[PDB]
């Protein structure tokens, strides 16, 4: 048996005709930038997240960055982020000049440990970016408290959590503003690079709009040193179709994991756990084990495709050396990075395929 | 009759099906980021600009930014640029933490005045961004001269110049590196936002690449604090289809212009001219007039669409006020920005259309 780590076939096949039609439809329109699908996606997406506004942009990274910027964050400003997130959450910060400051997660959730944040706060602090990793939220209520107390803007980095709920509410409406990636492989993935911001803050929004468009609100006029990071009319169209089935497919994903969660019985592996306040969307299904490479190789030899998120920690990436951190400053993220692994869980996976993985996992050593 | 400033129909009708098969083919392959179209297009394009390497990216603004960033450029740095170019040229400099230094253009060619380049060099100056506006080359020759004189990085901003030639040499093969925009409306447009960078410089090419990819050149490892600016497989395939006839559409464009060139004669309209060393691609066929506005409206009420490239100066833009410039500070530009104006010129315009265009123009 051979099980790819990730496979689009099913959901793609599933809407092929409808996708082909969206495309034929806009191509005929010969309008590819800042138009209709942009508007309706934004409106619908914002609707989906239960917040006033949505501004589409070029990618999830860009989403965050635009938000800090719209917040006017940059040099000699600092921003809290979880030690164990995708480096993309850090660039964003760095991209403004601001300084990302790391906070460890709670190994039980893979998400930033609130109880750990205050201690990171400083005169320079300006914001905290709570990332919803793997598809389940950060403990927003607690995070909230502290942000308030300190008057920090709280930004959700919701790239991996489309359609997730925290205590019954939509990821996207839990902080001051959220950022999303529509990268191909997401729960809601574009057919290319894509991202978007969502906020109830009209001003933040308006600004962010302009910055994504050369810093311009009207023709021939440029009010800021913006850039160019928009979401193509094509991608937005593709998103509109997909958004109708997000909830649908996410429940399937949930069904698979439940199945993983009941089935795996191997002492060396810790399976992932859905936070009590969470409705996990399982962007990824991660397990941890001591001899991860071994497990990984075993699995691969068994036709089972895996990936790690992420074997290498931001503070240990050569791109962040300057900071001068080393093995031991974030042991937790360190540990995780060393034992972590992601198993297949794509929409369309079949029991046979699913049982199969459980079985080889359970038979590991 | 009605004349659209632009109009993609003709071409798109023209390639509609092969486009669609490209789309269909890609979707079926479900591989959407950094794949074989990206790879093929890159190769195809570098070859077309006759350089060694091409690095696909998000848009022409990113492309510039990427070149600079790749060249370490940023803070405490100065980059020279036409005072009359598209703002994007400057935003790029700025995103890097560098400071844009503007140089007037040769009104004859609306392109950066080389004579004028040297007086702006400061010891902070690292590159000059020569822009090939509206479809033709700045005069690169003395510029390299200058650049070399000062150990500067010469960067072409070829976003408006797909396939224009300079003394027969292809745009994008002229300095240390070029930036292209695949904005849909360009001579070679994608079906969304698109950018490409070209160069023969392997180390930069290799750097831009990693940068464009979260500063990564190897899964799981990131060496630079980079960004996310790539060219979608979709967009890439689209272009590959387009690249083929880029050359052919560009010629028709040409006839349109030559046409206008003969036929337009009105004492208050200064028709644009193609430099001697150039193979103009006419991304934009711009004319100047002391009564620019009334002319526009005039042309408009006659159903002729036009645009302005551009009405306001980077330096006169709210965005660059920190710059503390004011009218008069950059006269040559201040001037064009007030008299300039773009008229329809799109693959597929019919004789009559053109005729109706010159006709009214003549009538003013
Ligand atoms: C020197 C220089 N450097 C860097 C850059 C940055 O390149 P970029 O970041 O890739 O945009 C530019 C871009 N430069 C151009 C700039 O010249 C300008 O060109 P423009 O005519 O003003 O823009 P336009 O009004 O959108 O479209 C031209 C016509 O095409 C039609 N159209 C347009 C679209 C998008 C469509 O889907 N369907 C249509 O029918 C309607 C319009 O009348 O504004 C663009 C956004 C920039 O990319 C540049 O010129
Ligand atoms: C918390 C957080 N913040 C910000 C960001 C940044 O948002 P962004 O700028 O939009 O990427 C991320 C990004 N998130 C992800 C990051 O987690 C990681 O995801 P990945 O699973 O490691 O990369 P991948 O190998 O492409 O993942 C998916 C699988 O899907 C298959 N695939 C992929 C593609 C693109 C395809 O076309 N066809 C395929 O079949 C191949 C792989 O097996 O790296 C990505 C490039 C980022 O987009 C994030 O997690």
Automatic annotation (TrEMBL), chain A:
One of its GO terms (biological process) is polysaccharide biosynthetic process. InterPro entries: DegT/StrS_aminotransferase (IPR000653), PyrdxlP-dep_Trfase (IPR015424), PyrdxlP-dep_Trfase_major (IPR015421), PyrdxlP-dep_Trfase_small (IPR015422). Keywords: Pyridoxal phosphate. GO terms for molecular function: pyridoxal phosphate binding; transaminase activity. The modification N6-(pyridoxal phosphate)lysine is found at residue 186. The keyword Coiled coil does not apply. The active site is at residue 186. Belongs to the DegT/DnrJ/EryC1 family. This is QdtB. It comes from Thermoanaerobacterium thermosaccharolyticum (Clostridium thermosaccharolyticum).
UniProtKB/TrEMBL annotation, chain B:
GO terms for molecular function: pyridoxal phosphate binding; transaminase activity. CDD domains: AHBA_syn. The modification N6-(pyridoxal phosphate)lysine is found at residue 186. It comes from the Bacteria. It comes from Thermoanaerobacterium thermosaccharolyticum. Belongs to the DegT/DnrJ/EryC1 family. The keyword Lipid biosynthesis does not apply. Keywords: Pyridoxal phosphate. GO terms for biological process: polysaccharide biosynthetic process. InterPro entries: DegT/StrS_aminotransferase, PyrdxlP-dep_Trfase, PyrdxlP-dep_Trfase_major, PyrdxlP-dep_Trfase_small. The active site is at 186 (proton acceptor). This is QdtB.
């Amino acid at each position: 048996m051979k099980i790819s780590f990730a496979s689009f076939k099913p959901m793609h096949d599933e809407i092929e005709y409808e996708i082909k039609f969206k495309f034929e439809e806009i191509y005929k329109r010969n309008w590819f930038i800042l138009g209709d699908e942009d508007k309706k996606f934004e409106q619908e997406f914002a609707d989906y997240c239960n917040v006033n506004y949505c501004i589409g942009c070029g990618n999830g990274l860009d989403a965050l960055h635009l938000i800090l910027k719209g917040y006017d964050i940059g040099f000699g400003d600092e921003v809290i982020v979880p030690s164990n997130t995708f480096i993309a959450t850090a660039l964003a910060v760095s991209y403004t000049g601001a300084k990302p400051i790391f906070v460890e997660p709670d190994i039980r959730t893979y998400n930033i440990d609130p109880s750990l944040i205050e201690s990171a706060i400083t005169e320079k602090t300006k914001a905290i970016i709570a990332v919803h990793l793997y598809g389940q939220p950060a403990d927003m209520d607690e995070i909230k408290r502290i942000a308030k107390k300190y008057n920090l803007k709280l930004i959700e980095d919701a790239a991996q959590a489309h359609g997730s709920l925290y205590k019954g509410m939509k990821v996207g409406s839990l902080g001051d503003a959220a950022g999303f990636s529509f990268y191909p492989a997401k729960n809601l993935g574009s057919l290319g690079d894509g991202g978007a911001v969502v906020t109830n803050d009209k001003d933040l929004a308006e600004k962010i709009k302009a910055l994504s468009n050369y810093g311009s609100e009207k023709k021939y006029h440029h009010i800021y040193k913006g850039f160019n990071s928009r979401l193509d009319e094509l991608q937005a169209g593709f998103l509109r179709v997909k958004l109708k089935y997000l909830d649908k497919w996410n429940e399937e994903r949930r069904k698979i994991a439940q199945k993983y969660i009941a089935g795996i019985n191997n002492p060396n592996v810790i399976i992932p756990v859905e936070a009590d306040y969470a409705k996990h969307v399982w962007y990824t299904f991660v397990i941890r084990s001591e001899k991860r490479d071994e497990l990984q190789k075993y699995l691969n030899n068994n036709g089972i495709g895996t990936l790690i998120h992420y074997p290498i920690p931001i503070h240990l990436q050569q791109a962040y050396k300057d900071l001068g951190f080393k093995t031991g400053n974030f042991p937790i993220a360190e540990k995780i990075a060393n034992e972590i692994l992601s198993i297949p869980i794509w929409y369309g996976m079949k029991n046979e395929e699913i049982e199969y993985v459980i079985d080889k996992i359970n038979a590991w050593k």
